[PDB]
């Protein structure tokens, strides 16, 4: 979270928190309810976001669900949608926390080794998360959309 980031920076520099990051903490706690309402607005739209993103991904990449591809078959497409579920939940966690820390610590560290073990193509992941970004930004107003897109494109860059 933002508080954790400020505390670890202070501890690394071995001094108390300055008025600047104290103001950072005040601003973060002042915006908590907006983060929670954004987290809901994403949460009711789980199925619509995930299914639209999967449809767009397999529109751009028919080879993935083509015979011989990674997502060929109903069960493997279900696993695709479940991975998108994981990443949408992680984006909600990041929005609530104020930074991307839950996103990496749960789904970015070691993701390349995991998906190499799973024959999962990383370009497919980045296209899927870009589709989820485009879908999720439409659900929100501009002020919410910008911050949510920050988490989404951080995740896209990390997957790439």
């Amino acid at each position: 979270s933002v508080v954790t980031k400020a505390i670890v920076s202070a501890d690394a520099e071995a001094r108390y928190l300055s008025p600047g990051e104290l103001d950072r903490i005040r601003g973060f706690v002042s915006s908590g309810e907006r983060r929670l309402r954004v987290a809901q607005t994403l949460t009711e739209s789980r199925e619509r976001i995930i299914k639209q993103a999967g449809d767009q991904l397999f529109q751009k990449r028919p080879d993935l669900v083509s015979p011989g591809g990674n997502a060929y078959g109903a069960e493997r497409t279900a696993s695709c949608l479940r991975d998108l579920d994981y990443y949408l939940r992680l984006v909600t966690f990041g929005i609530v926390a104020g930074d991307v820390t839950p996103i990496e610590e749960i789904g970015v560290i070691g993701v390349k080794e995991m998906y190499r073990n799973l024959e999962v193509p990383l370009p497919g992941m980045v296209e899927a998360v870009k589709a989820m970004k485009s879908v999720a930004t439409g659900l929100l107003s501009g002020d919410d959309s910008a911050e949510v897109g920050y988490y989404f494109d951080y995740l896209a860059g990390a997957l790439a």
């Binding site: 670890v8 690394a12 990496e104 610590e105």
Partner: protein, 277 residues
């Protein structure tokens, strides 16, 4: 007097007439069909050097000094363009190095300047304090270690994964991680086996202690360590110096502490960064 109206000029080298001694090597470099291959002037430089103190130079010549860039180990070659200046630098000559940081933290004036408090002039320091037995500081320290030892990140196939795992797990310290990087086969390939031995010693010294060598005491010691024990001997000896222990203990990644005036000139004298009058 020598040729007159009707005689073609000839080279007046040894045996034709009396030969000057003060320009011997330069003159017989000039009486060579490879003289046009050298574009740096050699006589103005020579006659200026006869009347001035020693330059800021590696004790084994200017071709032994690498460019102070992030990565690469770029040296001047004797053969592509001679451009070679030899200097009678003795064994007790101590080079004048410039601090990459607080000027009065230089070891020549302040012997305790290595353990001095870091200013904002100094580079970023990476230290591993994480439980020394989820943390992004460990990965930051790993990347900083790769950035110091190699100057850059390596490709995925080249990572010392086992040493990294031992690093976040706490079995080995940052110093042992740096040692595993510097004694690795990839470091030997990149910075040892394709270079003149003293060039490799100089570059490795700069990567590991963060400063050029001071003179022929250090270069000769590491040269004899090469002679006796090889690349591993040189690298382990540099890491086993006391100076390393005071400036970089077991916890902190090495960083650049000194530059040469040429390396400073590379950054400061670019048209953007020159101080405007």
């Amino acid at each position: 007097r020598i040729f007159g109206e009707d005689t073609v000029p000839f080279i007046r080298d040894l045996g034709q007439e009396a030969q000057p001694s003060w320009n011997w090597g330069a003159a017989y470099s000039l009486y060579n069909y490879a003289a046009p291959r050298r574009k740096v002037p050699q006589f103005i430089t020579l006659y200026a050097d006869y009347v001035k103190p020693l330059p800021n130079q590696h004790p084994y010549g200017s071709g032994n000094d690498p460019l102070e860039i992030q990565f690469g180990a770029i040296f001047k070659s004797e053969t592509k363009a001679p451009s070679a200046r030899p200097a009678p630098i003795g064994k007790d000559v101590q080079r004048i190095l410039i601090r990459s940081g607080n000027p009065i933290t230089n070891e020549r004036g302040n012997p305790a300047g290595g353990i001095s408090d870091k200013t904002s002039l100094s580079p970023q320091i990476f230290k591993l304090t994480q439980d020394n037995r989820v943390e992004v500081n460990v990965q930051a320290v790993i990347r900083a270690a790769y950035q110091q030892v190699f100057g850059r990140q390596l490709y995925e196939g080249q990572h010392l994964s086992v040493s990294e795992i031992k690093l976040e797990n706490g079995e080995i310290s940052v110093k042992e991680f740096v040692r595993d990087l510097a004694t690795s086969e990839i470091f030997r390939k990149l910075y040892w086996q394709n270079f003149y031995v003293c060039k490799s010693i100089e570059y490795i010294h700069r990567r590991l202690l963060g400063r050029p060598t001071y003179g022929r005491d250090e270069t000769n010691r590491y040269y004899d360590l090469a002679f006796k024990k090889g690349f591993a001997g040189v690298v382990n000896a540099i890491l086993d110096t006391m100076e390393y222990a005071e400036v970089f203990g077991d916890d902190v990644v090495p960083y650049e502490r000194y530059v040469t005036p040429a390396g400073l000139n590379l950054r400061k004298l670019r048209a953007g960064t020159v101080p405007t009058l």
